[PDB]
Write a protein that holds these residues in place. Sequence first.
Motif, PDB file in Angstrom:
ATOM      1  N   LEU A  86       0.810  -1.215   0.000  1.00 31.24           N
ATOM      2  CA  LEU A  86       0.000   0.000   0.000  1.00 31.24           C
ATOM      3  C   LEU A  86       0.847   1.271   0.000  1.00 31.24           C
ATOM      4  O   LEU A  86       0.521   2.240  -0.685  1.00 31.24           O
ATOM      5  CB  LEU A  86      -0.962   0.007   1.192  1.00 31.24           C
ATOM      6  CG  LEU A  86      -2.138  -0.970   1.122  1.00 31.24           C
ATOM      7  CD1 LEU A  86      -2.963  -0.913   2.398  1.00 31.24           C
ATOM      8  CD2 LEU A  86      -3.003  -0.677  -0.091  1.00 31.24           C
ATOM      9  N   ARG A  87       1.936   1.264   0.763  1.00 30.37           N
ATOM     10  CA  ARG A  87       2.791   2.444   0.864  1.00 30.37           C
ATOM     11  C   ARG A  87       3.694   2.594  -0.359  1.00 30.37           C
ATOM     12  O   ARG A  87       4.179   3.687  -0.652  1.00 30.37           O
ATOM     13  CB  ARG A  87       3.623   2.411   2.149  1.00 30.37           C
ATOM     14  CG  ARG A  87       4.769   1.413   2.139  1.00 30.37           C
ATOM     15  CD  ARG A  87       5.393   1.288   3.521  1.00 30.37           C
ATOM     16  NE  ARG A  87       5.821   2.579   4.053  1.00 30.37           N
ATOM     17  CZ  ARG A  87       7.076   3.016   4.042  1.00 30.37           C
ATOM     18  NH1 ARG A  87       8.039   2.263   3.526  1.00 30.37           N
ATOM     19  NH2 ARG A  87       7.370   4.206   4.548  1.00 30.37           N
ATOM     20  N   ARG A  88       3.914   1.494  -1.072  1.00 30.42           N
ATOM     21  CA  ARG A  88       4.708   1.526  -2.294  1.00 30.42           C
ATOM     22  C   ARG A  88       3.911   2.194  -3.405  1.00 30.42           C
ATOM     23  O   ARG A  88       4.468   2.893  -4.253  1.00 30.42           O
ATOM     24  CB  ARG A  88       5.112   0.113  -2.716  1.00 30.42           C
ATOM     25  CG  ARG A  88       6.081   0.069  -3.885  1.00 30.42           C
ATOM     26  CD  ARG A  88       7.354   0.837  -3.564  1.00 30.42           C
ATOM     27  NE  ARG A  88       8.357   0.702  -4.617  1.00 30.42           N
ATOM     28  CZ  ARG A  88       8.511   1.563  -5.617  1.00 30.42           C
ATOM     29  NH1 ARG A  88       7.726   2.628  -5.704  1.00 30.42           N
ATOM     30  NH2 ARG A  88       9.452   1.360  -6.530  1.00 30.42           N
ATOM     31  N   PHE A  89       2.600   1.977  -3.392  1.00 30.27           N
ATOM     32  CA  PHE A  89       1.713   2.597  -4.368  1.00 30.27           C
ATOM     33  C   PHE A  89       1.231   3.962  -3.885  1.00 30.27           C
ATOM     34  O   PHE A  89       0.271   4.520  -4.416  1.00 30.27           O
ATOM     35  CB  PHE A  89       0.535   1.677  -4.692  1.00 30.27           C
ATOM     36  CG  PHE A  89       0.902   0.512  -5.570  1.00 30.27           C
ATOM     37  CD1 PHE A  89       1.572  -0.582  -5.050  1.00 30.27           C
ATOM     38  CD2 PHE A  89       0.580   0.515  -6.916  1.00 30.27           C
ATOM     39  CE1 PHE A  89       1.914  -1.652  -5.854  1.00 30.27           C
ATOM     40  CE2 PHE A  89       0.917  -0.554  -7.727  1.00 30.27           C
ATOM     41  CZ  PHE A  89       1.586  -1.637  -7.195  1.00 30.27           C
ATOM     42  N   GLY A  90       1.905   4.487  -2.865  1.00 29.87           N
ATOM     43  CA  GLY A  90       1.715   5.861  -2.436  1.00 29.87           C
ATOM     44  C   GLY A  90       0.537   6.138  -1.525  1.00 29.87           C
ATOM     45  O   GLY A  90      -0.101   7.184  -1.638  1.00 29.87           O
ATOM     46  N   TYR A  91       0.246   5.212  -0.618  1.00 32.65           N
ATOM     47  CA  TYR A  91      -0.796   5.434   0.377  1.00 32.65           C
ATOM     48  C   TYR A  91      -0.182   5.645   1.755  1.00 32.65           C
ATOM     49  O   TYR A  91       0.806   5.001   2.106  1.00 32.65           O
ATOM     50  CB  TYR A  91      -1.766   4.253   0.424  1.00 32.65           C
ATOM     51  CG  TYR A  91      -2.676   4.137  -0.778  1.00 32.65           C
ATOM     52  CD1 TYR A  91      -3.796   4.947  -0.903  1.00 32.65           C
ATOM     53  CD2 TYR A  91      -2.427   3.205  -1.775  1.00 32.65           C
ATOM     54  CE1 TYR A  91      -4.636   4.842  -1.995  1.00 32.65           C
ATOM     55  CE2 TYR A  91      -3.261   3.089  -2.870  1.00 32.65           C
ATOM     56  CZ  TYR A  91      -4.363   3.910  -2.975  1.00 32.65           C
ATOM     57  OH  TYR A  91      -5.198   3.802  -4.063  1.00 32.65           O
ATOM     58  N   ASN A  92      -0.767   6.549   2.533  1.00 32.60           N
ATOM     59  CA  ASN A  92      -0.333   6.755   3.910  1.00 32.60           C
ATOM     60  C   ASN A  92      -1.166   5.929   4.887  1.00 32.60           C
ATOM     61  O   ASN A  92      -1.925   5.051   4.477  1.00 32.60           O
ATOM     62  CB  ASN A  92      -0.361   8.241   4.283  1.00 32.60           C
ATOM     63  CG  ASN A  92      -1.708   8.888   4.017  1.00 32.60           C
ATOM     64  OD1 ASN A  92      -2.718   8.207   3.849  1.00 32.60           O
ATOM     65  ND2 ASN A  92      -1.726  10.216   3.979  1.00 32.60           N
ATOM     66  N   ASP A  93      -1.027   6.216   6.179  1.00 33.42           N
ATOM     67  CA  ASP A  93      -1.740   5.465   7.209  1.00 33.42           C
ATOM     68  C   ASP A  93      -3.250   5.710   7.179  1.00 33.42           C
ATOM     69  O   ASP A  93      -4.020   4.961   7.778  1.00 33.42           O
ATOM     70  CB  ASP A  93      -1.174   5.780   8.597  1.00 33.42           C
ATOM     71  CG  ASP A  93      -1.007   7.269   8.839  1.00 33.42           C
ATOM     72  OD1 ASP A  93      -1.749   8.066   8.227  1.00 33.42           O
ATOM     73  OD2 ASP A  93      -0.129   7.643   9.645  1.00 33.42           O
ATOM     74  N   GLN A  94      -3.665   6.761   6.478  1.00 36.08           N
ATOM     75  CA  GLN A  94      -5.080   7.100   6.372  1.00 36.08           C
ATOM     76  C   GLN A  94      -5.699   6.521   5.105  1.00 36.08           C
ATOM     77  O   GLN A  94      -6.844   6.831   4.769  1.00 36.08           O
ATOM     78  CB  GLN A  94      -5.268   8.619   6.398  1.00 36.08           C
ATOM     79  CG  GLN A  94      -4.775   9.290   7.670  1.00 36.08           C
ATOM     80  CD  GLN A  94      -5.619   8.945   8.882  1.00 36.08           C
ATOM     81  OE1 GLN A  94      -6.751   8.475   8.754  1.00 36.08           O
ATOM     82  NE2 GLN A  94      -5.072   9.178  10.069  1.00 36.08           N
ATOM     83  N   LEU A  95      -4.935   5.682   4.410  1.00 32.27           N
ATOM     84  CA  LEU A  95      -5.370   5.059   3.159  1.00 32.27           C
ATOM     85  C   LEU A  95      -5.737   6.074   2.078  1.00 32.27           C
ATOM     86  O   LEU A  95      -6.627   5.836   1.262  1.00 32.27           O
ATOM     87  CB  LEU A  95      -6.526   4.082   3.400  1.00 32.27           C
ATOM     88  CG  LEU A  95      -6.145   2.784   4.111  1.00 32.27           C
ATOM     89  CD1 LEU A  95      -7.367   1.905   4.314  1.00 32.27           C
ATOM     90  CD2 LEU A  95      -5.074   2.045   3.325  1.00 32.27           C
ATOM     91  N   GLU A  96      -5.043   7.206   2.083  1.00 33.65           N
ATOM     92  CA  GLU A  96      -5.206   8.210   1.040  1.00 33.65           C
ATOM     93  C   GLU A  96      -3.853   8.501   0.400  1.00 33.65           C
ATOM     94  O   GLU A  96      -2.809   8.283   1.015  1.00 33.65           O
ATOM     95  CB  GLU A  96      -5.826   9.488   1.609  1.00 33.65           C
ATOM     96  CG  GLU A  96      -5.015  10.137   2.716  1.00 33.65           C
ATOM     97  CD  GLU A  96      -5.765  11.264   3.400  1.00 33.65           C
ATOM     98  OE1 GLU A  96      -6.974  11.427   3.127  1.00 33.65           O
ATOM     99  OE2 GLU A  96      -5.147  11.986   4.213  1.00 33.65           O
TER     100      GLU A  96
END
Length: 404
Positions: free
Chosen positions: A92-102
């Motif tokens: 998820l973080r590799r595809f550019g998402y933060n802890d808020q899933l945005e």
Amino acid sequence: ELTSACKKSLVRIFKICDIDGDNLLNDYELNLFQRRCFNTPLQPQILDEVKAVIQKNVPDGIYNDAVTLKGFLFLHCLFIQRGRNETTWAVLRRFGYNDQLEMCQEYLRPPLKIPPGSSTELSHRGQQFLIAVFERYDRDGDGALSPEEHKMLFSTCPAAPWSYSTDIRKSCPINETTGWVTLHGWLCRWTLMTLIDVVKTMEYLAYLGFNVHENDSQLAAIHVTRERRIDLAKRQSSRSVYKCHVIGPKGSGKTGMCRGFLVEDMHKLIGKEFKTNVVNCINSVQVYGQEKHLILRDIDVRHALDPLQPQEVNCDVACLVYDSSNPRSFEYVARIYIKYYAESKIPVMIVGTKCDMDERRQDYLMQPSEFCDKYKLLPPHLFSLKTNKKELYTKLATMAAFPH
Ligand SMILES: Nc1nc2c(ncn2[C@@H]2O[C@H](COP(=O)(O)OP(=O)(O)O)[C@@H](O)[C@H]2O)c(=O)[nH]1
Ligand SMILES: N[C@@H](CCO)C(=O)O
Ligand SMILES: [Mg+2]
Ligand SMILES: [Mg+2]
Ligand code: NA
């Protein structure tokens, strides 16, 4: 058993990883995006265990030895409910998402110090990416993106960067038969946006997954050009995208002139009304071998004394337009030139439209012929939509690419 905001983030990643556009995650891309997310090769046995668990727990979760979406959604669901969310979070973080899933802000728009006057274009990697994306969502294989295929392409984006009905079809080269956006028009539209809005074109490349595919910042997709003096550098920073402003009186036939850049047969634009106002039109021409993109922004002039904003004046090449079959027409071009372009460093070409009609006298002091002679300007170009010749556009691009 799986949060809604997480499903939306996982449904995008699937589409980005579906490089074949077959709605399946085949063996190749899975191992590829395993290096993208964990910098380690995917072990052959683990993949079997995964495909064994998915196939037994999910109906039609494995199609032709490949992972489907529901198989993909279940696997990461299984990861979270077994105390392994960091495996999903790494993806998820590799595809550019933060802890808020945005989408992360620094992931969408990286810092780009762009000098004043310098232009922004697509780099080779950027073009190669956008071409690959075009192929993936062109299911019918007609070499064009239907409004259906266009929406499917930007289903991984919060919204399309442009309308389909009132923009890309009416500002870029389209297929004559289907009326759909070809690969050429596709690259043209992105070229336009990249020049006039960099922070947007990079933002949308991230949604499409350039950062994961190219395995680099989307800065690698952007090429910053600048006309300089003679330099002996190894990197040729020669420009290739020029912006041309088309000014003149209303009804002088320049709106149809811009739209004619896109079509092969310009003759049909005569009786046709334009029910959608298009700001910029873009197409590609050949200037001494090298490919060149020219942008045509038509700017009508109501009253002769009405001022022009510096955003309307500043461009690469000014195409002043007068109706040759109108005596009251050329007067506007004279005013605009003397006021804004006479003491300028911008090349300028005077064009007399409707040369198919009887060329009339001008109710101005000087005639267009000797008006150019006074200011050391190249003789007026006679333009007609019935002639169907692209000679004018190639000269406009040539004047922008070269002195004076
Ligand atoms: N004969 C002829 N008429 C033209 C040509 N280009 C435009 N027109 C006429 O101009 C009208 C449309 O004007 P338009 O282009 O929208 O005005 P503009 O926006 O100020 O350029 C149409 O009714 C056409 O008849 C041309 O090349 N030849
Ligand atoms: N998330 C996939 C790899 C990247 O698509 C997996 O670990 O099964
Ligand atoms: Mg198609
Ligand atoms: Mg107009
Ligand atoms: Na695939």
